[model samples]
Target: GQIQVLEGLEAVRKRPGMYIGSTSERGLHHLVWEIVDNSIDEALAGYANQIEVVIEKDNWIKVTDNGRGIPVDIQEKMGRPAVEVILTSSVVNALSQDLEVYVHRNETIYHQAYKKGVPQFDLKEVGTTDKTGTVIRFKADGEIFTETTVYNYETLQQRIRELAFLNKGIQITLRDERDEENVREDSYHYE
Candidate 1:
């Protein structure tokens, strides 16, 4: 169901414990999984064949999927771009200090950015694109995650490998780009 509304996400930020069980490092990793799960949905539904995750510098997470980009049109009732609410009214987006979404669909690239679950602007057509997918990048909310904002590469790697094993064909790539000179990566695709 893509019927996400922004009003429903406010209380989650105030008490993330109920949704994700505390703002600890454990919950921090859940943030990554949450976004990845969205991509996994695309994979499971046969829209995406490849999912790429990057540990951007300063622990920012960027998950990109070669799936149908999230719908960008206004809702039947919400009166806002679907993508705006999809990203803004989410546990992951609500807890992130900042987040950006790039949707490549309908032969064009749409862009939107948010801060603490608020849209920076209405969705805008940034340019033309032949690709169709969704890219989401976000930084953990240091204000909420009192434990630590850093991420663990190995744990993420292990989990992605196992998830890819089950799905049985979607290419899953996890790249650690926190260190520019020395990069480590892995991809799993099973037939």
Candidate 2:
């Protein structure tokens, strides 16, 4: 008998813990899920077969998938590009201090960069490609969580392994490049 509308990022920013569960280490890990889930969705829909995740220097996480890239068309309701809407709507967007997205589709590549959930430049065609996929790189906002902001590689590996087991035939690769000696790469695929 009642309904309410939470407009824009107000609800998310106001109660982030509710949206992501907690503002602790678990929540910091949730940021990874928010982005990886999109790629997993593509795989679930049978459009993707491979997904790769990398933890880079300076607390940047990069995820790539060999799936149908996000549509570049305009969205009627928002009066803006669909990709823009996706980038802005994600909980990761609210949690990221910086974000960059690259979509490769139909042999063309489109890219956009965001700072603190705000678009930094126009979405434009960056290059041409023979491959098809989407790549998202983001740096988690330090102000939202603990000062360390370091992602636990083993924790991520376990979760990804579970995901691979759940989705048979799908391949997931995780790489940690934070330190040369600690560098590790793991790929999961179930026959």
Candidate 3:
């Protein structure tokens, strides 16, 4: 018998449709959910209380949560920072055209950016912050998906609202700052 190992992100890139659904609007939207789920997982574990999802212009999506930021220590398995492993495993490897991650913990901020699976710059330490949270922002690769790159705000809102209902007391906010005057903001929570 022979065993096969799928290394790195090869499996994801080779058959994205299998990992997500299809190279359609639904698949593109799944990328956002993948990032959001990480934060939601924190809330579920009682480490986070609030989560925010922001849809920026040019199809960039940002998900932030007041959770215990990802551990900065090097991992034994990959010999890379734990945060780097996460960034590569999730949306970055799947749909990102560009991705930026900010982890604020222990009064310090760790930031990094990547484009198309390649590091744009070295992992950087940028100043001190009293805040503790993680923010993941990424732009989906339009070339890999169907014609449209725009996300349906209503679609995202509904899904997030459902998550809030399922996880009571956890507040999830959805904001669209794409339009200045027409900016939309909504928060979901159950008492």
lDDT of 3 by residue, 1-191 (tens): 00111244556666778888888889888887887888888988889999999999877889999999987778787666778777766644446778898999889999988776555776789979999999988888876785677989999999999989988989999999888779999899998
Question: What are the models' TM-scores?
Answer: 0.94, 0.92, 0.92
RMSD in Å for model 1:
2.3
Per-residue C-alpha lDDT of model 2 across residues 1-191, encoded as one tens digit per residue: 00111244556666778988987889888899888889989999999999999999877999999999988788787666788878877788767889999999879999998876777887899899999899999998887775457999999999999989998988999999988678899999998
Query: Candidate order by TM-score, highest to lowest?
Result: 1, 2, 3
Residue pairs clashing, model 3: none
What do the candidate models score in CA lDDT, each in turn? 0.89, 0.85, 0.81
Q: What is the lDDT of residue 31 in candidate 3?
A: 85
Worst 10 residues of 3 by lDDT: 1-10
Ranking according to lDDT, highest score first = 1, 2, 3
Q: At residue 11, what lDDT does model 1 achieve?
A: 81
**Which candidate tops TM-score?**
1
